[PDB]
Each structure stands twice: as structure tokens, then as C-alpha cells.
Ligand code: NA
């Protein structure tokens with residue numbers, strides 16, 4: 001029932017959050033976790049995605065689930081982004097791309113005559129026992145948070 005196996009060490013990686021604290025995936029044991037990776041703070045698309053998740057947060061709560069957004073922007077950038085948009089969930093500053101690589105969301109594109117890496121917008125649903133049970137890759141923003149919520153309700 002796992003669609004992705006993560007390195008065991010992934011669950012103990014210290015994840016720097018907006019607000020200056022740290023978490024790990026293991027610390028979320030016991031409830032559902034949505035982890036949504038996005039390429040960059042404060043862009044039109046990535047802002048829309050975060051606001052879409054933020055608007056549905058009471059429905060996610062009803063399943064006791066929690067949301068984490070992830071990019072490689074700094075904690076300061078995340079703090080600004082969260083404050084300006086009013087997000088009520090944390091953002092991981094995955095500055096070294098450790099979590100991104102664990103979930104295999106760093107993808108290469110041959111453009112400008114060279115190989116360019118970047119975060120591919122992707123989302124994962126992690127069970128209360130830490131299994132990755134559903135994955136969405138190369139995500140288009142429109143309708144995405146709704147679809148993730150629907151899938152959560154179906155799994156939970
Ligand atoms: Na960190």
C-alpha cells in the first residue's frame with residue numbers, strides 16, 4: 001500500500017520551519033500528513049497553492065491531518081510569505097534539498113543548452129504510521145488542494 005519507500009533516515013531529518021522551530025516526519029506519527037512541495041515562495045502559482053490549502057485547513061483538521069509546505073527558500077523568506085498570506089500551517093525551509101531528494105522531487109530539464117535542476121511541484125499523503133500512500137507529481141495548481149483533500153477523506 002506504499003507508493004514510495006523513503007530512506008529510513010528521512011523520518012529523522014531535522015526540518016527547519018517557519019517561525020524558527022524544527023520538526024521531523026516521525027514527530028507527526030499518529031495522524032495524516034500532507035506534504036506539498038512547491039518550487040518557490042511568493043510566486044503567483046505557489047501563492048495560489050498555499051492559499052488554496054489554507055482555505056481548506058478546517059476540512060483537513062476534521063480528519064485530524066496536518067499540512068506541511070516545502071521549498072528550499074530560507075526561513076526568513078518563509079516567514080515573510082506566511083505573514084503576507086496568513087497561512088496557518090508551517091513551511092519547511094529545505095535549504096539543502098534533503099527532504100526534496102528523499103521524495104525525488106528534484107528534476108532535471110535540458111534547457112538553455114544545459115541541464116537545469118529544480119523542484120517539481122509534488123504532493124504526498126503520509127499515513128499515521130508514516131507510509132506514503134498517495135503521490136501527485138508535476139502538479140498543476142488549479143483544483144489540486146481539492147483533489148488532495150478528497151483523496152485524504154477517501155484514505156482516512
Ligand atoms: Na534546516
Ligand code: NA
Nearest residue numbers: 028033127128
Ligand atoms: Na504521519
